């Protein structure tokens, strides 16, 4: 979806642009934000040769999964717990991205509303 339906048919200035994002400071509405942590170091991801798009904040679980697949090679059905852990971390990353999208949307529609409301106060 309904987000595309609201953006294309309704007001386009009330919802975020996926390409131009984010448009507000990361600490604009937050008192304290802890910077995101990365477990696997650069050299570990280099030596694992994961991929450039796989070197996200979930890379440590991917390293775990690759190692587990490598050691237990003939038993290609034993690396299920690591697979689930990696998929759960990916799901957490995706819901975090959803949270960023929703925060962007609601601050963006709040800024317009408050600016035009204190404009309504300045009408006279």
């Amino acid at each position: 979806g309904a987000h595309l339906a609201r953006r294309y048919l309704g007001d386009a200035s009330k919802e975020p642009d996926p390409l131009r994002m984010p448009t507000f400071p990361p600490d604009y509405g937050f008192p304290e934000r802890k910077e995101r942590e990365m477990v696997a170091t650069q050299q570990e991801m280099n030596d694992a040769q994961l991929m450039l798009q796989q070197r996200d904040y979930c890379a440590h679980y991917l390293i775990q999964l690759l190692k587990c697949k490598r050691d237990s090679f003939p038993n290609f059905l034993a690396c299920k717990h690591e697979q689930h852990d990696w998929d759960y971390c990916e799901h957490l990353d995706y819901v975090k991205r959803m949270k960023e999208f929703e925060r962007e949307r609601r601050l963006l529609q709040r800024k317009k509303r408050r600016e035009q409301r204190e404009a309504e106060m300045a009408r006279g």
């Binding site: 477990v39 030596d47 694992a48 040769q49 390293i63 690759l66 190692k67 490598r70 971390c89 957490l92």
Partner: protein, 62 residues
């Protein structure tokens, strides 16, 4: 003659190629290049014996 086909069609060709690869292709540099083996935190290198350290005290979101 029971297994004659597997000798003149599989064993003989691989004898020549292995000889051709081992002593005539690798006699020159960069002819056979192998992708570097993946190194994971926790393995031991056969060449030096050094151990790659473990991967930094997991947050353990279990």
């Amino acid at each position: 003659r029971h297994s004659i086909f597997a000798v003149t069609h599989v064993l003989i060709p691989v004898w020549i190629i292995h000889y051709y690869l081992k002593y005539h292709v690798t006699a020159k540099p960069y002819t056979v290049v192998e992708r570097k083996p993946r190194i994971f935190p926790g393995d031991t290198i056969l060449e030096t014996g050094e151990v790659i350290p473990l991967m930094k005290e997991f947050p353990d979101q279990h």
